Paper text:
The refined structures of the two MnPs with manganese yielded near complete models. Thus, the model of Ape-[name] consists of 335 amino acids (from Thr1 of the mature protein to Asp335) and that of Cst-[name] includes 331 residues (from Val1 of the mature protein to Ser331). Besides the amino acids of the polypeptide sequences, final models, crystallized in the presence of manganese, contain a heme prosthetic group, two structural calcium ions, and a substrate Mn2+ ion, as well as 180 (Ape-[name]) and 171 (Cst-[name]) solvent molecules (with three Mg2+ ions from the crystallization medium also present in the Cst-[name] structure). Mn2+ binding was confirmed by anomalous difference electron density maps. As a consequence, using Ape-[name] and Cst-[name] as representatives of the subfamilies they belong to, we renamed both subfamilies as MnP-DDQ, with a manganese oxidation site made up of Asp/Asp/Gln; and MnP-ED, with a manganese oxidation site formed by Glu/Asp. It was surprising to find that the MnP-DDQ subfamily differs from previously characterized MnPs in two of the three residues involved in Mn2+ coordination, with Asp35 and Gln333 in Ape-[name] occupying the position of two glutamate residues in short and long/extra-long MnPs. Moreover, this is the first MnP subfamily described that includes a residue of the C-terminal end contributing to the Mn2+ oxidation site. The different orientation of the Asp35 side chain in the structures of substrate-bound and substrate-free Ape-[name], and the absence of Gln333 in the crystal structure of the Mn-free enzyme, confirm the mobility of these residues, a behavior that has also been demonstrated for the two glutamates of the Mn2+ oxidation site in previously characterized MnPs. Once coordinated, Gln333 also contributes to anchoring the C-terminal end of the enzyme, where this amino acid is located, restraining the mobility of this region of the protein. The kinetic constants of Ape-[name]-Q333P confirmed that Gln333 participates in Mn2+ binding (a 172-fold decrease in Mn2+ affinity was observed for the mutated variant) but not in its oxidation (kcat was hardly impaired).
Numbering used by the authors: 1 to 335
Amino acid sequence: TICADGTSVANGACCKLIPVVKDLTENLFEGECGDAAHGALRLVFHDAIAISPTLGGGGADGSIAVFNATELTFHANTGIDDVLDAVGPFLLKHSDVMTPGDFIQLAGAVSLTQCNGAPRVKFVMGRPPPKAAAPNLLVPEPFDSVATILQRFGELGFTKEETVAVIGGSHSVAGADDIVPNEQGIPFDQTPSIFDTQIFVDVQLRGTMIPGNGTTEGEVETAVPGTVRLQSDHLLARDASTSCIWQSFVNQQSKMAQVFGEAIFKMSLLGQTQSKLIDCSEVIPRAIPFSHGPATLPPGQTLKDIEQACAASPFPTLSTQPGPVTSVPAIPQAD
Ligand code: HEM
Ligand SMILES: [Ca+2]
Ligand SMILES: [Ca+2]
Ligand SMILES: [Mn+2]
């Protein structure tokens, strides 16, 4: 079926989403991989991961928005209020054509297409409205152990490979708003606007500093000024279960994107039954091709600054980015 804009879709029920996609790219993200995009991507996780085989939750159901009055009381959802201040108006204005679970997954898929190198993901629709808030304690925290993280993702059907890719890849295009005291938009990698493998490098370096004037639980030292490091990421890069996977993505941008894309789609299905869903992948914008060069060490760092953790292979012999040590700019906030 050809929609009013000229897009061909397999299922004409998808055409009603074309204006949503246009509104998101023009008016929420404004064609940029900035804070609005980061918030939409984070919201995918906080909505979808909040499901457990034994404790409940509906998964990718829109509960984080519909039942925000409850879910925003949960410590792990700190800062989701500010994300919803930017994204929530769009969810409401498009609530005539799609459920909130569908909206959140669409917005995350469209957000990725605003970022250099990020994959175009598959997108399906048909998720029913949510029944209840998620239980608390289903969203992983940055102070959770690797065993805890792997049990949560593993019990939901993710491989360790997918787990590392989706966490680390997301953190390629992301900052911390509620970790560094009184500071917002502190990136996890040197390039929060670029879906590259700098995150994997940046985290493997020996940490030497903390930004700002104190710490939050689940923060550790970082190696690059103007960035922050989560304990979870730190540990994922170093634990024997995951460290070789972490290392495997360094300077493997295409492989990391492919795995990331598949993991996001899997995440988008949590709590759902794939049988009742309709593919609307044609409505997703085209991706921006990765247009940067190889991964590099940050200025001033050398391979002796890498903390080797993978026993099977040495860390890749990357060149060092030329120039003086510089601080990474903070991300201007949408809210
Ligand atoms: C073990 C898993 C994870 C932990 C513990 C974790 C932790 C965090 C923390 C603590 C922040 C900062 C929040 C704040 O200061 O308000 C953050 C930011 C973010 N996370 Fe993760 N995260 C994980 C997985 C993921 C996944 C799977 C995705 C996406 C599907 C994701 C996407 C993001 C994005 C995009 C941001 C940046 C938001 C912004 O710039 O405003 N996270 N994460
Ligand atoms: Ca949910
Ligand atoms: Ca990056
Ligand atoms: Mn933010």
